[PDB]
Amino acid sequence: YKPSAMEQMNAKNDPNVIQDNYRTCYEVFVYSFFDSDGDGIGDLKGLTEKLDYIEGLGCNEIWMMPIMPSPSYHKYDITDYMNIDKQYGTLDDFDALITECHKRNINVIIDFVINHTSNEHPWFKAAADYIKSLPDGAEPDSSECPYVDYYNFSKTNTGGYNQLPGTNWYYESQFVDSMPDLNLQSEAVRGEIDKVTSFWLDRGVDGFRLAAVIYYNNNNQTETIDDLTWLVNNVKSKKADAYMVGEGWTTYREYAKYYKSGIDSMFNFDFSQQDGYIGKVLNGAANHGASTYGNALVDVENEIKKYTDSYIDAPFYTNHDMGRSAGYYNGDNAEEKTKMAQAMNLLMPGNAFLYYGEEIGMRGTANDETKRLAMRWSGDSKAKGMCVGPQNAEETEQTYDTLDKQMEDPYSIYNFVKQTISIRNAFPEIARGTNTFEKDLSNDNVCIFTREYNGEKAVLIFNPSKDEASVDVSSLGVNDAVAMLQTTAAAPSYKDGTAKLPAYSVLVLKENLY
Ligand SMILES: OC[C@H]1O[C@H](O[C@H]2[C@H](O)[C@@H](O)[C@@H](O[C@H]3[C@H](O)[C@@H](O)[C@H](O)O[C@@H]3CO)O[C@@H]2CO)[C@H](O)[C@@H](O)[C@@H]1O
Ligand SMILES: [Ca+2]
Secondary structure, eight states: OOOOHHHHHHHTSOOOOOSSSOOEEEEEOGGGSOOSSSSSSOOHHHHHHTHHHHHHHTOOEEEESOOSOOSSSSOOSOSOTTSOOTTTOOHHHHHHHHHHHHHTTOEEEEEEOOSBOOTTSHHHHHHHHHHHHSOSSOOOOTTTOGGGGTBOEESSOOTTEEEOTTSSOEEEOSSOTTSOBBOTTOHHHHHHHHHHHHHHHHTTOOEEEETTGGGTTTTOHHHHHHHHHHHHHHHHHHOTTOEEEEOOOSOHHHHGGGGGGTOSEEBOGGGOSTTSHHHHHHTTOSTTTHHHHHHHHHHHHHHHHTTOSSOOOBOOSOOTTSOOGGGGOOSTTHHHHHHHHHHHHHTSSSSEEEETTGGGTOOOOSSTGGGGOOOOOOSOTTOTTOOOOOTTOOOOOOOSOOHHHHHTOTTSHHHHHHHHHHHHHHOTHHHHSEEEEOGGGOOSSOEEEEEEETTEEEEEEEEOSSSOEEEEOGGGOEEEEEEEEESSSOOOEEETTEEEEOSSEEEEEEEEOO
C-alpha cells in the first residue's frame, strides 16, 4: 500500500475530536449491515462487531434506522416502543452495543417515530375494536377506551384519512392505511411518549432522530411546532446534552421555522438529492457553478438565524429515502464527482451525516428497498456476515468495488471519504466555526470559505469543476496549507498566497493572526 500525497499531508495534523454534539454520524440500516448469526439478516450483534470499522472510518456517532418491533423490513411502523425487533436481537444485545459504543466515544442516536404507529400496535387494535363495537348512536367515550383519543377517528374523510374496514369510521393515516397517525396534542399520548423517552434514555441513548417532524399534527404547522417543542423539552428536561435532529422534508424557508422548537438540528434537505445544491453544482446545473454552493450555505444559515443563534446544522446529502450519491454521476469523472459530493457534504458546518455504503459508492435508486441494499463488505460469495438485503429490491448494476478492495486502493471513494473525515476531525472550526463565503474570491470553478471558532481560522477552497483553477487568497492574510483532498494523482498546491487546485479537489489552510 502506497499512500497518496493527500494521505501523507493530512496525517501530520493531530486529531482534535471534541466531546460535544458536533460529530460525524454514520446512518446504519441494521437489516442490511452485518449479520452475526448467519440468517442473512443484519442485527445489533453484527453492528457491534463492526464498530472498529466505523471508528476507523472516523465517525464518532451512529444513527440506526428503527430497531423496535415492526411487521415490515424497514421498521418505521412500530408495534412496541420498549423492545427490540426479534430480527435485530434483544434488549441485552442493545445494552452491549451501547457499552461498546461509549468505550469508543461513539454516541448512539435512535430513530424516534412518534408521528404514527403500526395499525398492529396494541393501542390501535384496541381503539379499532372499540370503535367497531359502538352502535349507530355512537360517539366514542375516552373513559371507556382512552386509546380512541390516541389516534384521530372521524365519520368524515378529511385529508389523509382511510376507512376502518367494515365500519362508517375513518382514521388519519397520512403515509398509508397501515400507519395510523398519533394525536400528539393528547396528554395521554404525551404521557406514553414520556415513558418511552425515559426507557431509552435510561439505557444510555445519546439522542434521537425525529421522523416526519413536519407531520406531527398533519397540516397545522402551529400545533406541529407546539408538539416538537413539547418533545424537545421532555427530552432535554431529562438529559440536557441530549441531541435531537428533525426530518423536515421541505425547502429551507420551511424547515428553518422548525428551529423555533429549540431542536438542535434540522436535516439540511436543500443540499440533498441529485437536484440539491451539491448535485446541481457537480453536474453543472447551478446558475453560478461552485459559487452557488457558497450562496446556498449563506442563504440557509441566514434563514435559520431568523429563528435561532444557537443550533447545529445537520448536513447529510443522501439517506435511506433517496437514490444513492453514486447514481447521480454518470460518464466522465463520475468517480471524481462522487468523491467531491461527500467533501461538500461532510465539510459543511454542524453535525455531519454519512449513509452506510456511500463511502464505497454503492448504487441503487429504483425503489426504496433498492436504496437499502446489503453493505458490500467483500466480493467473496460466502463471507461471514454478508446480508441478503430487502427481498423486493430491483436489479442494480454497481460501478465501484467492494470495501475490502477499496481499503487497498489509495484512490478509492472509501479512502477519499476517510481522508475527508480526518480533516474534519483535525479542525474543529470546520464544524463549529462561523461561516463566511468569500464571494469576491470565488467564481464558477472555485468556492472559498473562512471558518472561525474561538480565535482559530481555516480557509476551505473547493474545486468542484472539471477545470484546474488558481486563486489569490493573500487578501485573507498569511496562510499555511495544512490539508487537501485529491480525486486523482493531481494534487492541490499552495505558494505565496496563490492556491492551485486541479479538477475535483479541496485545499485547507490555517490563517496566522498576530
Ligand atoms: O405506501 C406508500 C409508500 O410506501 C413506501 O414508503 C415507505 C418507505 O419505504 C418506508 O421507509 C417508510 O418511510 C419512512 C421514511 O423512510 C422515514 O425517513 C420517514 O421519517 O418516515 C417515513 C414513514 O414512516 O414508510 C413508507 C410508507 O409505508 C414506498 O416505498 C413509497 O414509494 C410509497 O409512496
Ligand atoms: Ca442475523
